[PDB]
Amino acid sequence: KPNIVLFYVDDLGWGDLSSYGATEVNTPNIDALAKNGIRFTDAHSSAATSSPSRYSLLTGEHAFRKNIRILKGDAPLVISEVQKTLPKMLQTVGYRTGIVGKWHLGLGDGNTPVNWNEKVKPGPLEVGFDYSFLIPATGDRVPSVFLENHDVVNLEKSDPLFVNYQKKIGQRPTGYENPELLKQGADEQHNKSIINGVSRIGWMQGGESAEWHDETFNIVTSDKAKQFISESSKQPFFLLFSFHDIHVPRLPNEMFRGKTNMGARGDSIVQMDWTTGQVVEKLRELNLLDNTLVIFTSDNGAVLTDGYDDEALKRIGTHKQNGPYRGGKYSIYEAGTRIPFIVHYPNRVKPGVSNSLFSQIDLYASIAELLGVPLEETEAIDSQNQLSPLFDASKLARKTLVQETPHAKGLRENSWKYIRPTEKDVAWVKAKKNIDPGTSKAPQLFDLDTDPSELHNLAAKYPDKVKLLEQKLQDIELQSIRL
């Protein structure tokens, strides 16, 4: 029973790592993991946005089965208290489970809004986690406080904490009223309550003692992960290290500012690599690294301009955050879900590069197979046993895989890519995010071997292929049991 450490980066694109070809940023720690492990070139998150991908990561099922969308800071937990989750699965075989970082899976129960001043339940502790130290929503969503287990860290009863997303509450300055105090400019959605010089989404009243310090996320989070690892060093443990990097607002520690010529976004990649090093080296000191299944991946494709004036697009230079793939965050094109995926397990995995169609949804069933945990017919219905290609870069994995986004759905059948037509008009992606969302009123079909960036639609040349793929996409939607 090896330990499992899951590095889950926020918005890390296929090309944002030097082992994936980046030249404007060096990721040495993550690169050494790829060198002594398997690097996947065709691995995918379940969706093109955070909440849905995180839901599939932990439940082994497609996010559309529960219509998961980007959650707001006070949304209720999307994972039922009895739902079968990956951490619960590992618990039944003695693993001590923990998560350090971003949650974004909801925290309340729905009936009554979240009272950030009393115990916050259900949450990570109710869906398979023993220990939890989180960032409730996202780095840019209030509350800007750490929630340990069931309690908000450093909360003073003398200064109760409240949040509101529709109107201003409290006496904190905002970005629209007080733009003078901002460290970075913000768009309309992100110009509310200011905390640590940066406005966020929504208003935050009180709880000043519970306020976090963005520039120390690297230290605070690595410190917690190292402690949890030290506490569970003599037993099997699973640690989901969920980063805030490289999600907006990008506020890296001063020791990284200027390490790249790309601005805060690039420097956040440097910080992210450093943080990863702290955890990896911690496992090395305790001689646990060779017997640890390390998985380094991301929740969705990269984005440059995501709401703050941080120079991501202006100073991009020659950097290709999505490598050769088109799209990015929010998009149905490859880059929306095609991301970095590294497996590092020296005791059982030989170094290699895998071009197998791999999905993060299959982590649940592949880890069950690793430890012999039989799965119910109703458990992680979409998660397939793909442990063999996970540990051998030469083995094949999937043939078919559905890609999700709020705007459209798509399907991969070997090198074929099909995007189902939609009438939804989503211009905010192209306008505000500088990404083609991939929608179209007409079907789309691409051969990624000759057209890797999805520039030549073949829907009209192979109309039966479109119908076949559309048919197989319907079957997967109608599926309700395993296999």
Ligand X SMILES: O=S(=O)(O)OC[C@H]1O[C@@H](O)[C@H](O)[C@@H](O)[C@H]1O
Ligand Y SMILES: O=S(=O)(O)OC[C@H]1O[C@H](O[C@H]2[C@@H](O)[C@@H](CO)O[C@@H](O[C@@H]3[C@H](O)[C@@H](OS(=O)(=O)O)[C@@H](O)O[C@@H]3COS(=O)(=O)O)[C@@H]2OS(=O)(=O)O)[C@H](O)[C@@H](O)[C@H]1O
| Shortest CB 264 distance to ligand Y, Å | 14
Region of 184-192, 209-217, 314-322, 475-483 interacting with ligand Y (CB under 6 A)? 184-192
Least distance to Ca ion from the beta carbon of 111, Å? 29
Q: Which does 476 bind (CB under 5 to 8 A by kind): ligand X, its own copies, ligand Y, none?
A: none
**Is 309 among the residues that bind ligand Y (CB under 6 A)?**
no
Coil, helix or strand at residue 188 = helix
Q: Which is nearer to its own copies, 387 or 435 (CB)?
A: 435
Beta strands in 128-274 (DSSP E): 131-135, 147-148, 151-152, 162-164, 185-186, 194-195, 198-199, 203-205, 237-242
| Spatial distance between the Cα atoms of 184 and 141, rounded to a whole number of angstroms | 15
Nearer to Cl ion, 117 or 386 (CB): 117
Rg (CA), the chain: 21
Q: Which of 23, 80, 92, 189 binds ligand Y (CB under 6 A)?
A: 189
Q: Which of residues 45-84 bind Ca ion (CB under 5 A)?
A: 50
Q: How far is the CB of 58 from Cl ion (least distance, A)?
A: 35
Q: Which of 383-419 are b and which e, b meaning 16 or more Cβ less than 10 Å from the residue's Cβ?
A: bbbbbebbbbbeeebbebbbbbbbbbbbbbbeebbbb
Question: Under the rule (CB under 5 A), what is the footprint of Cl ion?
Answer: 156-158, 261, 457
Least distance in angstroms from the C-beta of 201 to ligand Y? 7
Question: Within positions 3 to 42, which residues make up the interface with ligand X, using CB under 6 A?
Answer: 10-11
Site for ligand X in 65-94 (CB under 6 A): 70
**444 strand-pairing partners:** 419
- Residue 149 interacting entry, from its own copies, Ca ion, ligand X, none, C-beta within 5 to 8 Å by type: none
Select the residue whose beta carbon is closest to Ca ion and give its number.
50
396 binds its own copies (CB under 8 A): no
Nearer to Ca ion, 58 or 473 (CB): 58
Q: Which of 69, 121, 395, 482 binds ligand Y (CB under 6 A)?
A: 69
Question: Read out DSSP for 387-408?
Answer: HHHHH-TTS--BSEEEEE-SS-
Site for ligand X in 312-351 (CB under 6 A): none
Select from 4, 190, 220, 217 the least CA-distant residue to 95.
4
- Tell me the closest approach of the beta carbon of residue 414 to ligand X, in angstroms: 29
Task: For residue 403, give Cα distances in angstroms to 52, 357, 365, 392, 415.
Answer: 11, 12, 19, 24, 14
Block residue for tokens 């945990």: 373
Beta-bridged to residue 76, according to DSSP, are: 108
Q: Could you tell me the maximum CA-CA distance found in the chain, to the nearest angstrom?
A: 68
3-state SS assignment for residue 425? coil
Q: How far is CA 474 from CA 33, 261, 443, in A?
A: 38, 46, 15
In the complex, the smallest distance separating the C-beta of residue 261 from Cl ion, rounded to whole angstroms, is 4
16 binds, among its own copies, Ca ion, Cl ion, none (CB under 5 to 8 A by kind): none
Query: What is the spatial distance between Cα 40 and Cα 68, in angstroms, rounded to a whole number?
Result: 26
219 interacts with ligand X by CB under 6 A: no
CB of 247 to Ca ion, least distance (A): 6
Residues forming beta bridges with residue 294, ordered by sequence position:
5, 344
Please report whether residue 248 would count as binding ligand Y according to CB under 6 A: yes
Q: Which helix (H) or strand (E) holds 342?
A: strand 341-344
Q: Considering the rule CB under 8 A, would residue 313 count as an interface residue with its own copies? A: yes
Nearest distance in Å: CB 290, its own copies: 24
Residues engaged in binding its own copies (CB under 8 A):
20-21, 23, 41-42, 304, 313-318, 320, 323-326, 353, 355, 415, 434, 436, 449-453, 455-456
Residues engaged in binding ligand X (CB under 6 A):
10-11, 49-50, 70, 104, 138, 140, 189, 247-248, 306-307
Residues engaged in binding Ca ion (CB under 5 A):
10-11, 50, 299-300
